[PDB]
Amino acid sequence: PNSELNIYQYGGGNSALALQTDCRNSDLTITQHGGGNGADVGQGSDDSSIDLTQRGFGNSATLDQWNGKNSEMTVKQFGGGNGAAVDQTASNSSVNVTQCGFGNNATAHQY
Amino acid sequence: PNSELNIYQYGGGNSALALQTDCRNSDLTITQHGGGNGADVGQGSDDSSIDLTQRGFGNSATLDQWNGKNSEMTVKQFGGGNGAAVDQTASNSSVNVTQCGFGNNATAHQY
Amino acid sequence: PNSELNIYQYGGGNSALALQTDCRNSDLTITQHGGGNGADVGQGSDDSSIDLTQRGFGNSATLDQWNGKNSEMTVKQFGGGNGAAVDQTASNSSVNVTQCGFGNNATAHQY
Amino acid sequence: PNSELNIYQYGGGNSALALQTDCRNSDLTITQHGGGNGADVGQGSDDSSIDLTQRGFGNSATLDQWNGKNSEMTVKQFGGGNGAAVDQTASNSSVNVTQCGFGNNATAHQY
Amino acid sequence: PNSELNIYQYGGGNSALALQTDCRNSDLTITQHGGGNGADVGQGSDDSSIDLTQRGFGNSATLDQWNGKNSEMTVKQFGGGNGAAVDQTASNSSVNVTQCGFGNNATAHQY
Amino acid sequence: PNSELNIYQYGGGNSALALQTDCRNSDLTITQHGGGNGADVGQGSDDSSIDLTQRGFGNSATLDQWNGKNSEMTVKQFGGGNGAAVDQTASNSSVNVTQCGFGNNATAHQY
Amino acid sequence: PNSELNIYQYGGGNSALALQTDCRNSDLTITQHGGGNGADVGQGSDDSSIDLTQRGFGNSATLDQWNGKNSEMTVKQFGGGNGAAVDQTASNSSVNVTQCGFGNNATAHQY
Amino acid sequence: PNSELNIYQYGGGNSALALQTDCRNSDLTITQHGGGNGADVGQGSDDSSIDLTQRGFGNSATLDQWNGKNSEMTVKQFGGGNGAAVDQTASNSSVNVTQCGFGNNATAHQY
């Protein structure tokens, strides 16, 4: 059971919360480029992947993948002030979020 | 159940909210080109597809895929300020909604 | 049941409402060219087809196909301000309404 | 395998790398307060904990916990430009690093 | 094997080098007060202790405790520029170094 | 074997060399008060003690306790520039040297 | 064998050389008061005593106990430049030498 | 064998030569008052005594007591430049020499 959590933070003013529990063979990566991006990621699913990359300024993300299996979730934010929340509990399922520009709001739920 | 939810944003000021639940072997894709388009997509149908594409400005869409099976959704806006709302519950059914121009309103239902 | 609802707008200020229920293996098609054309189409007929084409300005059509089977409705306005109201319940029947010019009014009923 | 990795950055310009694999039931905690602090932490040890606290600016610590069991590693850097390098492979073992001030360099290896 | 390594540095410009390997149930403590103090301490001895206290400036002590058991090594440097070099390999043995003043040099070997 | 070696230095510039090997259940104590005191003391005798007290400045003494048993070694140098050389090898023997004043030299041998 | 050597020197420039070997339960006391007194005392006699007291300046004494038993050896030199040479081998014997003044020479042999 | 040899010199320039060998239970006493007085005394006589008293300047005495038993030897020289030569070998014998004044010469033999 290899669980991997990576937090890559470049620039100034980025802040991160990352959480894995009961998630076997799961990968969760946080990469922040720029400034002021705040991150909160929860992973509790086996054989699942969470990939959160922030490039820009002022983006905020809340990401929860629970009780799933063989699930891939991706959130990529480019630009400024974009806010994302992703909840994924479906098994063998994928959620992909990519927001480019300013002030974009995205909410994704997969059960 | 291989379920994919895709949000691709190009431009500035677009907003999207996506819902996919109890949804086996189906795809939900939201693509916006331009600015200020607003979207709300709920998909709960097995072996189904929703394709919502916005190219232009100020278009508004609401899409609901519920309790169906083997159903297809393709909803397209070209231009400005087009507003569409579609409810589809029929199985083995498809609704293909397109607007070209400005200020067009379309309502579609399938049961 | 392969049932399709189609709405196409070209121009500006056109409005179309389409409702189709209990209508199996049937097509709903609306095409509006120009501006200010208004459409209200109800389809509840099995193995039936509705084709409404408005080309021009200010044309209005109210179309209802209920309880029929193997029925076809083709309503076409060319010009300005033409008004059509057609109600069809007969099975294995076809009504074809065509208006050319300005201010034409046509009512068709088939039972 | 409840394996948790937390990294907290408050301020701007901090850099931290955290790596957890082959590491069951283990916690890796990074807390960076200020700006420009550097951290590289690798964790591959069972039932182990890593705690890193950098408070100030420009501090450096390179931290490796591999192959160990029931092992705790603590480093607390207070001030500016402080350097500590700690490798841990010993089981049931602890290393405590406490740097206060500017330009401090102290290295510990535990096997 | 509850083995603890502690370093306490107060002031600026102090350097200490500590090594604890294969070293079960043992403690290594370094306490530097002032500035520019240097210490090199290696510990490879079971159930052993190393206590080093440097208070002042420019003090240097090079300490090695290897292959011993139940061994205690104490060095206390008070003042400036003091040097003590001690190697301890004997088991159930104790070394005491006490330097007060400036430029003191005392060397101890215990086998 | 409880073998404990003590060096106490008060002032600045005092120098002392102490060596304890194969010397079981023995105490090695050196006391230097003042400045510039030089001492070389080697102890390899079981159940033996060496007590060296230098109070003043520039005192020099060489003490060797080898191969003895139940032997006590005492040297007291008070004043300045006192020089004493003592070798003790006999068992159950005591050597006592007291120097008071300046420029004293004393040699004592016990076999 | 409780055998002790005592050397007491008060002032400056006094020199005393003492050897005790093979000599059980025996005493040697050297007391030098003043300056420039020279003493050479060798003892090899069981349960024997040597008492040398030099008070003044430039006094010289050479004292030898070898192979005797129950022997007592005394010289008291008061004044300046006194010279005493005593060799003792007999058992149960005592020689008392007392020099007061300047330039005294006294030699004692007892076999 | 309590055999005790005593020299008492007062003043400056007095010289004494004394030898006591094979001489058990006998006393050797030499007393010089003044200056430049010379003494040569050899004692090898059992249970015997030699009492030599020189008071003055430049007095000379040579005394030999050999092979005798229970023999007493008295020389009292008062004044200046007195010379006495006495050989005593007889047992149970007493020789008395008394010189007062200047330049006295006394020779005594007892066999």
Author numbering:
A (entry chain C), B (entry chain B), C (entry chain A), D (entry chain D), E (entry chain E), F (entry chain F), ...: 41 to 151
List sentences quoted exactly from the publication behind this structure.
Curli, a prototypical functional amyloid formed by IDPs, serves a pivotal role in bacteria. Using cryo-EM, we have shed the first light on the cryo-EM structure of E. coli CsgA fibrils, revealing that the amylogenic regions of CsgA adopt non-centrosymmetric beta-helical structures.
The final CsgA fibrils for cryo-EM imaging were formed in 10 mM CAPS buffer with 0.01% Tween 20, pH 10.4, without shaking, and heated at 70°C for 30 min. Acceptable initial 3D models were generated by using box sizes of 218 and 260 pixels. The overall architecture of CsgA fibrils illustrated that seven and eight CsgA subunits could be assigned to the map of 218-pixel and 260-pixel box size, respectively. Interestingly, we also discovered two major spatial arrangements of CsgA fibrils in class 2 (15.5%, 120,429 particles) and class 3 (25.5%, 198,126 particles) of cryo-EM density generated with a 260-pixel box size: a 3-CsgA-fibril bundle and a 2-CsgA-fibril pair. Surprisingly, in the 2-CsgA-fibril pair, two protofilaments made contact through the sides at a specific angle of approximately 34°. The distance between the centers of the two protofilaments was measured at 37.6 Å. Due to the limit of map quality as a result of preferred orientation, the real resolutions (around 4–6 Å) are lower than the reported values (3.6–3.8 Å) by cryoSPARC, and therefore, the detailed interactions between these molecules within a fibril need to be revealed by further higher-resolution structures.
